[PDB]
Structure formats: C-alpha cells, structure tokens
C-alpha cells in the first residue's frame, strides 16, 4: 500500500538515528590499554577416525567427555574423547544429515537434514540398543539446526524461513517463528534457555522470545549469507559468521555493532563460530582449511589451528573450556588443547 | 595397564569399527545418480521406465543404482548443492514439446548453464534426456521452431530441428577438456534408456579407474 512506502522508511530512519545517538564511543578505544593476549599455540592431542564421508556437524556433551558427530555416510557416532572409543554407532534412515545435537541430560540425541524431518533417538533403553523415540514432521524445507531446550522440548531451524518449537511427547509444533526472508542456517540458545537468535541467508539476525513467540530485535550489517552464530557466555552478546570473510559482534542491550574481525589475506567464508569459557577468545573455521583464533576484545589474530586437509564445517568447545574439537570434510576429528 | 572394563570397552569399539568398515565397503560399490530437471519434463516417465529428497533403487546387470530426486526442494540451491559432490553422473531431463510454450526452453537453458558450470561439478559427466519425441514431431509439423529461436535458419523438419537443440544445449558446456556430456532421445515407450545409462556409467567408471591408477 501507499502507507507502507513511507512508514517502514520512517521507522528505519528513527532506529538509525537512535543507534547513532546511542554510540558514544567504540570498543577499541576503551579496550586499547588492555594488554595483548599473546601468541596461542595448540597441539592436536587426539584424532578420531572411523567416518567415511564429509563431517557436517558435531556437539559436546554436558560432561565435557562425550561427543556426537554426524556425516553423510549414514552413521551417527558417539565418541569417548579421553580414550577415542566408539560408545555407539547409530545407523540413519536418510544419509543426507546436516545437523546433530546432544541433550543436556545425556539421554537423547537429535539429527536432521534434507529429509525435512528431525529424528530423536533414545540412548538409555532396557533392550540394550538405540531406537528412534520420535520423528517430527511439518517443515517444508531442509532442516539446518536443532538444539535441545530440555528433555521434552527442541528448537529447529529449516530452509523455509521459519523456526519452530516442538513438544517431543506429542510431536506438535508448540510455536512458530516467522519474519525471515531467506533460509535460516543456524541458531544458538541463551544460557538461561529463555531467548535464542537465528542467522538467515537475508544477511540479518533476529532475537526471538521462546515464552512469547515474537521477534524482539533485528540486527543487520552483514553483506552476505550467515552460516554460524553463537552466544557470548555472559548472554548479552553474540557473534556471527558470514560468507564475506568477516565475523562481527553484536550486543542485545545496546542494539548496535561492536567489532569486526576481518583480514586482507582471508577471502573465504566462515563455517563455524564459538567462544571460550571466559569469552576472551573467538574461534572460527574457514574454507581455507584453517581455523583462526581471534582476540575477541581487541580484534587481533592470536593463532591458527592448521592441520586439516579440507573445509572445516563444525567447531565446538567443551563446557569446562578444556579442549577444542574441530571436524572437517576429510572425515577426521581433532581435539586441540 | 587397562582394567577389565576398559578392555571390554576397547573390544566393543573394535567390533563397532569392523561393522563400520564392512558397511562402508558394501556402500562404496553402488552407483549414485542425481536426477535434475526443469519440472513436468518427463521426469515421471523416466522414473516409470526405471516432502524432501526421494530415493529410488533399481538393479541392472548385477549393478545397484540409486537415483536422487530433489524436485520438491524450493529453498536456495546454493546451500545444499555441494552435498552431491561425489555423484557419478547427473541425469538431465528436458521436454522438447515445451519449445513453443510459456519460453520454458530458455528456463531449461538457464538451469543447464547454472548446473554444468558449478564449482563442484567440474569433472562430473552429465546425461541428457530429450523427451516428448512424437509430440515434438507433431508440434513442429505445424508450428515453426523460429518462435523459440529468433535466429534459426533451416528446414522445418524434425531431423534438422532436433540436431539444432542438440548443439545449442551442448554449447553451454564450456569445460570441454574435462567433462563429457552424453545425450539420448527418448519417448513414452523406449525400453532402452537403462542400457544408455549403463554405458554412460561404465565409461565414467573406466575414466575414474584410469585417473586413480595415474595412467590418464
């Protein structure tokens, strides 16, 4: 209509003016006197073998010892990182898996992909095997990410520009989140599991409200698709990884942009983003087979985790911040320290 | 120095590894094909002759084939196209009768141009199927081909026109030094496309073996 041709522009202009008036200083100016972190050297402590195809996702258990990896060979493997033993090996009905998750309690795992169905597996059964507890349907596009809120809830992001909250007991969509104009690629949950953020292909990110079901904030500033997102450990900031070879830091309270981590020698896109236990480091896997460690408070590179022969697709940090595990398209998993 | 439980866990892990290796060896000898198309272009007919992703299994001459159909995916292709980076061949279906309807031939040109020059399919052969043979002949018996092709100059006969679509489709493959595209005409009742696909996949397998040996 004629009204929307000016109302949206006026609202955007008002938001931009509020942001401009709210930016008194910059992060670099305040954290210019802080001492540098220094060079960070990490060595490959363990190497996990057994996958026969590209690895697309992985997750860490709450105990900081067990992890689950997903690959397009039709298998879901649970590893014991301390001894590199295979606790379980779940065979998937559909081999086009694109994501996986680990329940906080440790009883269930989830996976999904091009089949538009999120499958939930029960690990602790009296029969001694692993069986599919529930299969969720309703998404009209490929499923990109899934995270466990508790033992009876799960949040999924699909390629049909929607995110939904499920109820595992019944299988019905409890709430649906809309507003994006492109494929949603990843999401991360807040520490208190009351809010979460999603990164879509429309070069934007949003802050939802699980209890209510409405977008409370929208963040822009990128120039291409967004492939990764992660919350700061404090819970008042998050980082994004785009295809324009640039990671950025956004703050919920200020509703602004804080930093940008880019270098001339890097032109490839970012596939994963994660933080350290105290949030002083920011790791990110790239398409150039490397994984740079960024000083999150000064935007200076501190080290590189070279040693992968193909694209790095997944990246995670244990809950105690003791080790970093990366997975690449060469069907190998490495634990750094 | 391991205890009893640790030794038993190691034994279980070794058994899991053996099962994984056996499964990988079993699944590494199957032929994988990705079935593309512009929609309503004889894909159903081709499937007859042999939510999300759809898989079809058929056996020919003691060889197990897998066909993946991604027609139902309405999302962005740039995100999930890299999954099928290890497919042995790509099957493309284009309807000939749609030459004078709306323009669809130009959409097929665009789809073929996008697919054939992707950064992932730089060495993957493409099998091209042209459908609606008799229908196309019946249509060209009255409707000239110049409506679809403003620059065409030739006889209004099936033999000339069919070859003209052939060269225009094959010209888009501007990577002739590594990829070879195999083309075949077909209709509602042929009962010979299985042999053509078998020949194409045998050629691809021979070339892959030669590359693996380093001979060529």
């Amino acid at each position, epitope marked *: 209509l004629d009204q929307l041709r000016q109302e949206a522009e006026q609202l955007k202009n008002q938001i931009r003016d509020a942001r401009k008036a709210c930016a008194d200083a910059t992060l670099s100016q305040i954290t210019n006197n802080i001492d540098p972190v220094g060079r960070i050297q990490m060595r490959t402590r363990r190497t996990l073998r057994g996958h026969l195809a590209k690895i697309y996702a992985m997750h860490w258990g709450t105990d900081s010892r067990l992890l689950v990896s997903a690959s397009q060979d039709g298998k879901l493997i649970i590893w014991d990182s301390y001894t590199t033993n295979k606790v379980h090996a779940i065979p998937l009905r559909s081999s086009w898996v694109m994501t996986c998750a680990y329940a906080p309690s440790g009883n269930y795992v989830a996976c999904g992909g091009l089949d538009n169905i999120c499958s939930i597996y029960n690990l602790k059964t009296r029969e001694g*095997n692993v069986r599919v507890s529930r299969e969720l349907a309703g998404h009209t596009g490929y499923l990109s990410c899934c995270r466990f809120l508790d033992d009876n809830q799960i949040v999924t992001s699909s390629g049909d520009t929607t995110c939904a909250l499920w109820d595992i007991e019944t299988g019905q969509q409890t709430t649906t989140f809309t507003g994006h104009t492109g494929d949603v690629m990843s999401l991360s949950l807040a520490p208190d599991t009351r809010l979460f953020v999603s990164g879509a292909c429309d070069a934007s990110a949003k802050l939802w409200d699980v209890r209510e079901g409405m977008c409370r904030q929208t963040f822009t500033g990128h120039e291409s698709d967004i492939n990764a997102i992660c919350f700061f450990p404090n819970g008042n900031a998050f980082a994004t990884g785009s295809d324009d070879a640039t990671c950025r830091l956004f703050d919920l309270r200020a509703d602004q942009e804080l930093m940008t981590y880019s270098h001339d020698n890097i032109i490839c896109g970012i596939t994963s983003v994660s933080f350290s236990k105290s949030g002083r480091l920011l790791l990110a896997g790239y398409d150039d087979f490397n994984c740079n460690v960024w000083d999150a408070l000064k935007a200076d590179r501190a080290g590189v985790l070279a040693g992968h022969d193909n694209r790095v697709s997944c990246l995670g940090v244990t809950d105690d911040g003791m080790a970093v595990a990366t997975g690449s398209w060469d069907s190998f998993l490495k634990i750094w320290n | 120095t391991l*205890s009893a439980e640790d030794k038993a866990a190691v034994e279980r892990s070794k058994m899991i590894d053996r099962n994984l290796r056996e499964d990988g060896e079993k699944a590494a000898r199957e032929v994988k094909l990705l079935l593309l198309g512009a929609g309503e272009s004889g894909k159903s007919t081709i499937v007859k002759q042999m939510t999300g992703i759809v898989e079809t299994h058929f056996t020919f001459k003691d060889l197990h084939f897998k066909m993946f159909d991604v027609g139902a995916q309405r999302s962005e292709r740039k995100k999930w196209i890299h999954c099928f980076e290890g497919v042995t061949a790509i099957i493309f279906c284009v309807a000939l009768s749609d030459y004078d309807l709306v323009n669809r031939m130009h959409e097929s040109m665009k789809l073929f141009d996008s697919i054939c020059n992707n950064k992932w399919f730089t060495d993957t052969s493409i099998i091209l199927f042209l459908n609606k043979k008799d229908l196309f002949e019946e249509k060209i018996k009255k409707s000239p081909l110049t409506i679809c092709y403003p620059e065409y100059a030739g006889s209004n006969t099936y033999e000339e026109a069919a070859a003209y679509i052939q060269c225009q489709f094959e010209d888009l493959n501007k990577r002739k030094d590594t990829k070879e595209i195999y083309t075949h005409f077909t209709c509602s009742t042929d009962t010979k496309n299985v042999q053509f696909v078998f020949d194409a996949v045998t050629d691809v397998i021979i070339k892959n073996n030669l590359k693996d040996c380093g001979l060529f």
Partner: single-chain antibody, 233 residues
Framework: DVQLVESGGGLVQPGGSRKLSCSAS????????MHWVRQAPEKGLEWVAYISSGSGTIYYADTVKGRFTISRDDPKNTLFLQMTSLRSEDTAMYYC??????????????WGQGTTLTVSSSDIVMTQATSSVPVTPGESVSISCRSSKSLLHSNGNTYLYWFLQRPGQSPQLLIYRMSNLASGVPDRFSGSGSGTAFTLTISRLEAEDVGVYYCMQHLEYPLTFGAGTKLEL
C-alpha cells in the same frame, strides 16, 4: 519384556556329564556379555565362567578350568555351558547373568532364574565378617564390606558392586562403582567408602528389604563374592 529362562538340571552320577542352556528373549542378545554364576546350598555365590560379545574373550574359574566349556549361539539366542567329569563339589544352582561394557554402562544388570543341579554322592579376598543383623522397620542400617587389595584404579573408578537376594528370588543389582544407583532402585539405598574399606547405607528400612547382601569386585577378572550378610526381623 526382558527375561532369561534356563534348563538342564536333574540328578547326575559322579564323573558324568550334562549340558545347560540359557534362553534369552526381550533384548539385543548379540550385544551383551554373558556370565555363569553358581551358588551352593547356603554357601553364598561363586563366579564360574564368562564369555564376551562376539565370543572373542573367554575366562574360567580355576576350580573348573579345563573341566567346563561355555559357548553361545546368537542365531537362536541361547547360551550353553558344557561340563564333563563333575564331582560332588559342583552341586549348586546356576544363574544366567547379562552384562554390557561401555563408558557409563551398568554390568550385571539382570539375572536369570536358576536350575538345581543335585548330584548324588592374586585372588582378591573380600570379607564382610557379619552374619546376621536384627532390625525393626523404619530404622537405618549400615553394611560394611572390606577387601584385600585397594580397588581404586588409576582412572578414578572403584570397581565394587552390591547385590541383594530376596528369599527365593534371584539377586538384583543395587549399586555399581560404589556410588551409582541401578535403575529401578529407590533412592534410600546409598553407597560410600574409600579404597579397601566400603560401606552401604540404608536410610529408611521398610518391608521387602530383608535378605542377604553380597559385595563383588570387578578389578581382577577372577571375581570373588563376599560371604554374605543376612538381614533378619
């Protein structure tokens, strides 16, 4: 449901032979390791033999080593114990026990039913030193089991298990690794202690908890059970 049924009992003459079978139904038999545990009349339990998953590892008690044979047949879910040249000292009930070993697993989870085998005519020592304890309902009870060699391994795990046998019933797992609680067990039971000195505690002693308690070690594969502490009243 999960259940194990055994058969093959009866009277045997000295020096003879007999075959025992264990029929399993309700779980993944091929993914479990199977044990054979016998119990002489009023003389506590005693480990006999063990066969791993895939039949890749077999162990025997030295008292029957070279005399008994154990085998499994995954096709039809049956476990066999072939014994030849038996003597009068082998008269006892025989139990069929399952166990799966992985990180965080619960071995010795489920026990069989037992078949009578009436017949006519290094080595870690676990001690309980208690015979009977008369206790009224509603109180709290404590049971102490002591071993010879410390059971705390380098990994930090302390391999000690607690079992309870109700009158005329198969033993049930209660606590594994001296701190975990088996599934289906009420929270009243609790385990604690240090190396070489363990102790199990019951908070609210109620009915159906009367029986005999045994403590087992799982560090050195020759397994020894405790003498058994009986609970009366």
């Amino acid at each position: 449901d999960v259940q194990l049924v055994e058969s093959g009992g009866g009277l045997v003459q000295p020096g003879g032979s007999r075959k025992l079978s264990c029929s399993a139904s309700g779980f993944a038999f091929s993914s479990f390791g199977m044990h054979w545990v016998r119990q002489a009349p009023e003389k506590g339990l005693e480990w006999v033999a063990y066969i791993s998953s895939g039949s890749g590892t077999i162990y025997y008690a030295d008292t029957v080593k070279g005399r008994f044979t154990i085998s499994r047949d995954d096709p039809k879910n049956t476990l066999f114990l072939q014994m030849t040249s038996l003597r009068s000292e082998d008269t006892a009930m025989y139990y069929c026990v399952r166990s799966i070993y992985y990180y965080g697993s619960s071995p010795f989870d489920f026990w069989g039913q037992g078949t009578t085998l009436t017949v006519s005519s290094s080595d870690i020592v676990m001690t309980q030193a208690t015979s009977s304890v008369p206790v009224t309902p509603g109180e709290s009870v404590s049971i102490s089991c002591r071993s010879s060699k410390s059971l705390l391994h380098s990994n930090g795990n302390t391999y000690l298990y607690w079992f309870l046998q109700r009158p005329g019933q198969s033993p049930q797992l209660l606590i594994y690794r001296m701190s975990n609680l088996a599934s289906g067990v009420p929270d009243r039971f609790s385990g604690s202690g240090s190396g070489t000195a363990f102790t199990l505690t019951i908070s609210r002693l109620e009915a159906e908890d009367v029986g005999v308690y045994y403590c087992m070690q799982h560090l050195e594969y020759p397994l020894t059970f405790g003498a058994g502490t009986k609970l009366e009243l």
